[PDB]
Structure formats: structure tokens, C-alpha cells
Design a protein around this ligand. Structure first.
Ligand SMILES: O=C(O)/C=C/c1ccc(O)cc1
Length: 322
């Protein structure tokens, strides 16, 4: 008999809590043969702001968290390789690449302090806005919410005023008019009532404008101090295949959410790959400043970008078992 607490920042019925974390938690419960019990706390019920979740898991406030790596900005700089503009065409391939790279580069450097169970990205990042956005010029003077320093850099370069705030705060911020719009993929839009609060959406054909990285993290001491066969049980239900499943389940949930916006009669602008090039011209210098930043930290930035593209093409869709 062991009770582990999982703390996370969205409601219990949202896509990732329901179809990724519960699934994962039940799999741990089963493979343990009812010897591990995992209690699930949503919407920061045990207290804190979403950015403190990692520290909650490192310090032992909670055993397990699902958080957004970028809410601790520049803390895990190697994850940023997947957050560069127009990097990612498939979330599964990204998550494959992310887990593989986590093991080689990150596990014992930047994530030494914590146990990582899962490394993934969401579906295509996009805009949701009070007024229409069909070309970059339309974002000039708009206050746009972003969730990470690289998204904020992206917003600056296309001419928006970036407002850093965690995702649950979006509804209140739109309602009060603190922001004119937000970045987020489709899937989380319905839990935040975004399609109710704004009437315009801007999506991209081709590689994603951006996506953000996530982890399922666990307290190290709480892991190590399990017995050897229960450690084996946690690891077995986590890691590479789990990371591929979370990314894919999260991206696949874009579809039903986009259709809820369509059903309302909201205006959705789809930017062709050809028309995306104007956006790329504005955002693509992030590649050079990011590599300069990494080099300033003694990190081979270009090697991470090359490696990440290498691994993603390499992804076969039958490394996807979970
Ligand atoms: O942009 C952010 O601040 C967070 C993004 C996010 C997107 C989908 C989720 O299910 C949770 C967080």
C-alpha cells in the first residue's frame, strides 16, 4: 500500500488530465496490483501557481506533477529546441525526439534534481483573438498572452505585445480586456471557454507556428525509496512510449475542440504553407539568437537543432505502442 499525490493545473475533465494522466495513473495502479494508489488533484487544488509545480515535485509537496517546462523560463534550456518557430510537423515525432534527447543530454545535467516520467509537446500552437488575424500586420498593437519566453519572443517579432501568464488565467484576462487574445493549441480552448470569449482563430497549415514542452515529473527521494520492483513498475508505464502517447493524444484532441468553434460560427483563418513564409521571415531569426544564447551557456545549440530534426524524421509510427 502506497499513496502518491499527482498535482496539475487544469480541471479533472480536461483532455490531458482525463486521457493522458488518469490513463497513466490507472496503468501504474494495475501494474502495481493495487499496491500503488495515485490521488489526482486538479486546478492547483493543493495550492500554488502552475509555475511552482516543478518545485512542488522537487521539494516533495506533491509526489507527481504535470507542468509546462517554459513556466520555469530558461531553467531547462535544452527543451527549448522543440519550441523554436516552425520546428514541429508531428507531436508524436517531437515527443520521440524529446524523450531520446532527454536521456542523452538532460537527465543528469538540467533535470538531475527530479525524476522525469514523460516528455512531450502539444498540437499546433495558434492564435485566438477578439478581432481577426489573417496576416502578421493584424497583430500590431494587440496584447497577446504567451506561456514561455520563446513564444513571447515570437509575439514581439510579429508585432504583438506579449503578456506572460499561465494558461488557467486566460479566461479572466480575456473577460476583463487585459489581453486582446492568446496563444494555445485547439484542444485546451474548450476547458477555458475561449470560443465563448473571442470570435476569431488563426491556424497554420504546415509545421506548427510553435508548440510548448511538458513533463510528468516525480519527486526523486519518493521514487528511490520505493522498493526495487515498484520502481520497475513506475518506469515500465512511463518513458519513451508513454511520452509518444501523451503528445499524440494531446495533439489528436485539437480536432473535437476546433469543431466546437466551427459549430459556434466563429471565424477561423487557415494560413497556407505559402502564406506562412511571411510569418517565418519575422520569427525565424529566433533560431540565430537562441543558438547564440546556448553558446553563451557553453551549449552546442545547432547540434541540438540538427539532432532534433534528425530524430524526428527517424520516428516510425509503430514505435507508438502504449
Ligand atoms: O501556452 C501555455 O501557457 C500552456 C499551454 C497548454 C496547452 C494545452 C494544455 O492542455 C495545457 C497547457
Amino acid at each position: 500500500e502506497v499513496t502518491l499525490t499527482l498535482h496539475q493545473f487544469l480541471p479533472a475533465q480536461a483532455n490531458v488530465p482525463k486521457d493522458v494522466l488518469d490513463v497513466w495513473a490507472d496503468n501504474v495502479e494495475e501494474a502495481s496490483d493495487g499496491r500503488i494508489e495515485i490521488e489526482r488533484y486538479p486546478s492547483m487544488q493543493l495550492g500554488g501557481t502552475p509555475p511552482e509545480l516543478m518545485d512542488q515535485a522537487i521539494d516533495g509537496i506533491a509526489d507527481i506533477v504535470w507542468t509546462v517546462v517554459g513556466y520555469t523560463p530558461g531553467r531547462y534550456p535544452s527543451t527549448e529546441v522543440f519550441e523554436l518557430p516552425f520546428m514541429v510537423s508531428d507531436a508524436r515525432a517531437a515527443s520521440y525526439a524529446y524523450w531520446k534527447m532527454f536521456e542523452e543530454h538532460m537527465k543528469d545535467g538540467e533535470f538531475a534534481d527530479v525524476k522525469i516520467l514523460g516528455t512531450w509537446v502539444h498540437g499546433p500552437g495558434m492564435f485566438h483573438t477578439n478581432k481577426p488575424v489573417a496576416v502578421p500586420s493584424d497583430l500590431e498593437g494587440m496584447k497577446i498572452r504567451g506561456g514561455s519566453r520563446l513564444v513571447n519572443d515570437l509575439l514581439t517579432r510579429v508585432g504583438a505585445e506579449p503578456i506572460g501568464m499561465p494558461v488557467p488565467a486566460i479566461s479572466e484576462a480575456l473577460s476583463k480586456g487585459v489581453i486582446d487574445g492568446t496563444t494555445i493549441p485547439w484542444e485546451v480552448t474548450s476547458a477555458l471557454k475561449v470560443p465563448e470569449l473571442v470570435g476569431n482563430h488563426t491556424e497554420f497549415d504546415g509545421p506548427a507556428l510553435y508548440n510548448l514542452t511538458f513533463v510528468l515529473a516525480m519527486n526523486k527521494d519518493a521514487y528511490e525509496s520505493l522498493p526495487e520492483d515498484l520502481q520497475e513498475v513506475i518506469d515500465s508505464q512511463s518513458g519513451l512510449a508513454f511520452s509518444i502517447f501523451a503528445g499524440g493524444t494531446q495533439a489528436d484532441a485539437d480536432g473535437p475542440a476546433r469543431q466546437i468553434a466551427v459549430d459556434r460560427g466563429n471565424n477561423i483563418v487557415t494560413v497556407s504553407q505559402e502564406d506562412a513564409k511571411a510569418w517565418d521571415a519575422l520569427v525565424n531569426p529566433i533560431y540565430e539568437t537562441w543558438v547564440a544564447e546556448m553558446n553563451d551557456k557553453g551549449i552546442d545549440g545547432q547540434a541540438l537543432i540538427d539532432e532534433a530534426k534528425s530524430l524526428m524524421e527517424e520516428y516510425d509510427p509503430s514505435m507508438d505502442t502504449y
